Amino acid sequence: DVVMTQTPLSLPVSLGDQASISCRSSQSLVHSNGNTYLHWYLQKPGQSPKLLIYKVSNRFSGVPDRFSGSGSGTDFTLKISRVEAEDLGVYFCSQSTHVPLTFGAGTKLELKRADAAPTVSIFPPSSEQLTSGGASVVCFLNNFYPKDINVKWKIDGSERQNGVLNSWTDQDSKDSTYSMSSTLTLTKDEYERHNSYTCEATHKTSTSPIVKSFNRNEC
């Protein structure tokens, strides 16, 4: 019932940058006897949470000499010093001064890489899927950065859609870049009454959209 606000929810960092992840409670945590049960946790992807620092500054048994807790009452700060790769995942603050235990939304330390223009590809529905009674025009926007990306769909020009399923990958160790796939699931009938299918990727490395499109009445 205290709401642990974390600042910020995403945090791009070069691997020798100082990082700072900031938490803030809706009430004062200075217990009436005990004192400031504000705790920070680390959870690497595909894994359980790990205890880092307890009661703002008291590090836990293992936590490298790079973790620095501090703060008073409603303001708290987790400061990792030189961001080693081992540390990338989500950082949580928790409170256990009041029942119930409330955690923050979690802050994700992402990794810095320069800007990248995505490779867009539009694909038409395989005869094989048509034969079931639905259609999916998949659009793959591949290897971009940053993850600020917007896809728009155009059927015969007519603006937008509402049968879209976007899904992002996490950071692709290698080019280091996110990938994303806009699926558009129509009905056989609808498909067959509409000609041109457009994917329009809106990205920071272009003021002009990356447009990829195909033409139903062909292959």
Binding site: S48, L51, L101, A105, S121, F123, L165, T169, D175, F214
Partner: protein, 219 residues
């Protein structure tokens, strides 16, 4: 690790029940408070329950959200922790962690690997995999994306393997999303244009629940 270890996670139809177990070998299990914390695949951490120990007459605590649905029990004899989750709801669907207080420093310290509780009435559907391939155009540059759409399965996971004999691929494995009851997913591969379509690409989609293995030659 010292480990807390948990089981009896599964697929329950709504209003069902599970007896989740947790196993903590440690110095003085006998003396610490034992916790249960869910993490629904949708966002964050929410504490479900907690039980004190013998001294504190096994004082049992619960989050408003699970009260009366769940019972937390402990059996020091065998270092066992339990959670009777009755009359479930879809919103219970989460990863269940076993959490052991570290009496001497702070509480909510040690968390095991977790486990899965899937609440949904949907049955065990196979996957319909369909191959995405350019359309007309053929090879538009040096490399070219290929793909597989895996539409319509329950539950959670499929494994998509690619057959691209040595070919300089970059396979993005995309997370599945829920889609009108069953999940959908997609995977992309990029090939050398000076090998497509001579070289036979294939995607290999297995589904554990229901021992299915569909192969789709990309042509």
């Amino acid at each position: 690790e010292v480990q807390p270890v948990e089981t009896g996670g599964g697929l329950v139809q709504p209003k069902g029940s599970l007896k989740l177990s947790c196993a903590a070998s440690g110095f003085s299990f006998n003396t610490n408070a034992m916790n249960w914390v869910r993490q629904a695949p949708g966002k964050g951490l929410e504490w479900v329950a907690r039980i004190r120990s013998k001294s504190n007459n096994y004082a049992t605590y619960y989050a408003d959200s699970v009260k009366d649905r769940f019972t937390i029990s402990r059996d020091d004899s065998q270092n066992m922790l339990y959670l009777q989750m009755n009359n479930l709801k879809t919103e219970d669907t989460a990863m269940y962690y076993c959490v052991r207080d570290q009496t001497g420093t702070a509480w909510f310290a040690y968390w095991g690997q977790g486990t899965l509780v899937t609440v949904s009435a949907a049955k065990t559907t196979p996957p319909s995999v369909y191959p995405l391939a350019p359309g007309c155009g053929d090879t538009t540059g040096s490399s070219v994306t290929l793909g597989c759409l895996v539409k319509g399965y329950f539950p959670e996971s499929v494994t998509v393997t690619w057959n691209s004999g040595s070919l300089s691929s970059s396979v993005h494995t995309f997370p599945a999303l829920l889609q009108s009851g069953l999940y959908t997913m997609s995977s992309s591969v990029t090939v050398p244009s000076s090998t497509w379509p001579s070289q036979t690409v294939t995607c290999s989609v297995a589904h554990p629940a229901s021992s299915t293995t569909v192969d789709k030659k990309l042509e």
